[PDB]
């Protein structure tokens, strides 16, 4: 599978008529471009090296699009104040996710378009790219407006055409970075917990991409319930970290084993506490 996404946010500012607008593009979940209206010169910037392959026209055309997006979010934000009878002053947020998924057959699996107001679902284009799902009463106003105007045809055309085309291009252009892995470096630590009981923590560090599985085992059986699993976190260098711990009887640590699964591992790792 492969994917492209643009995640946009406009934030209403107390005392200012222009919203803060930020747009981030991802290919396969990796940021590749970025626009921020607060920057000194507001323009789209490469965020992955394989994007330097684009000439000045690209960044010019992308930047122009963003100034159009700025105004669209500004007006829409103003409209939402009416729909919810919201006071002047205040800060409010409007967000947009759009893009496409490609299948194993590199064909368009699905297109996406969603909006949220105040961090909550507002309206979404359904998988058919014809209908709209409104989450509440105010979004029904927007749904009905957009049915009456043929909004969906415009978005549909972007999602099946331009999105797909450039995704193929980026996948070709950034192939050697995007399709790489970094397999985890893994070890087990041992810590005090309580009277006659210890924690065994299984670390996996420096890995890419983010998807990974850590499991613990005693006597041949999984410990799904009984294990603590942190949320996967960026190391700061493009790689990620995760760990999984279990609370264990003191003296019975060797009976416990940890397994790590990752795309960069042909055969999964088996780890054990080593005194």
């Amino acid at each position: 599978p492969h994917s492209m996404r643009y995640f946009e946010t406009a934030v209403s500012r107390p005392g200012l008529e222009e919203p803060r607008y930020i747009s981030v593009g991802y290919v396969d979940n990796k940021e590749f471009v970025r626009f921020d209206s607060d920057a000194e010169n507001p323009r789209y910037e490469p965020r992955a090296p394989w994007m330097e392959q684009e000439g000045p026209e690209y960044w010019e055309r992308e930047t122009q699009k963003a100034k159009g997006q700025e105004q669209w979010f500004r007006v829409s934000l103003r409209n939402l104040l009416g729909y919810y009878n919201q006071s002047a002053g205040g800060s409010h947020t409007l967000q947009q996710m759009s893009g496409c998924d490609l299948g194993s057959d590199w064909r368009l699996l699905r297109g996406y378009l969603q909006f949220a107001y105040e961090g909550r679902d507002y309206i979404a284009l359904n998988e058919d790219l014809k209908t709209w799902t409104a989450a509440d009463m105010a979004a029904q106003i927007t749904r009905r407006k957009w049915e009456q105007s043929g909004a969906a045809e415009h978005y549909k055309a972007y999602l099946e055409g331009e999105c797909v085309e450039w995704l193929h291009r980026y996948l070709k252009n950034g192939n050697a970075t995007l399709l790489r892995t970094d397999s985890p470096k893994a070890h087990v630590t041992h810590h005090p917990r309580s009277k006659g009981e210890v924690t065994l923590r299984c670390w996996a560090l420096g890995f890419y991409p983010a998807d990974i599985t850590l499991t613990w085992q005693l006597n041949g059986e999984e410990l799904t319930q009984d294990m603590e699993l942190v949320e996967t976190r960026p190391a700061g260098d493009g790689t990620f970290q995760k760990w999984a711990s279990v609370v264990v009887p003191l003296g019975k640590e060797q009976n416990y084993t940890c397994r790590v699964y990752h795309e960069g591992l042909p055969e999964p790792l088996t780890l054990r506490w080593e005194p």
Binding site: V33, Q96, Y158
Partner: peptide
């Protein structure tokens, strides 16, 4: 390549 929104607002 980013999307330009349809000219109908929310």
């Amino acid at each position: 390549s980013s999307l330009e929104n349809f000219r109908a607002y929310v």
